[PDB]
């Protein structure tokens, strides 16, 4: 009636990744702009 009934440091989940991931995505948009600028410069 009492004993029979029976049912660690935190792990980075989406706090570290959010900042890092936003950086990677932010670079990708800038990279797309850079290539368009680079191709435009190479056009002339």
């Amino acid at each position: 009636w009492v004993r029979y009934q029976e049912c660690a440091p935190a792990t980075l989940t989406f706090e570290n990744m959010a900042g890092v991931f936003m950086l990677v995505a932010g670079g990708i948009v800038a990279g797309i702009f850079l290539i368009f600028i680079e191709i435009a410069y190479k056009r002339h």
């Binding site: 792990t11 980075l12 989940t13 989406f14 570290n16 990744m17 991931f21 990677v24």
Partner: protein
């Protein structure tokens, strides 16, 4: 003893207990090499691709 004598309120507890030496230095489990959540690893792979 309580049948022939008359005891009193137990002022100290006792019983047939078990003594076990404590396991010094708990070892990190096999899955201790993953601090990142499973969603963490999947997101990293997708970003790499």
């Amino acid at each position: 003893r309580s049948e022939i004598v008359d005891f009193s309120v137990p002022f100290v507890e006792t019983g047939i207990s078990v003594m076990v030496a404590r396991s010094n230095g708990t070892v990190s489990p096999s899955a201790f090499l993953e601090p990142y959540s499973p969603a963490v690893w999947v997101m990293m792979f997708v970003m790499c691709l």
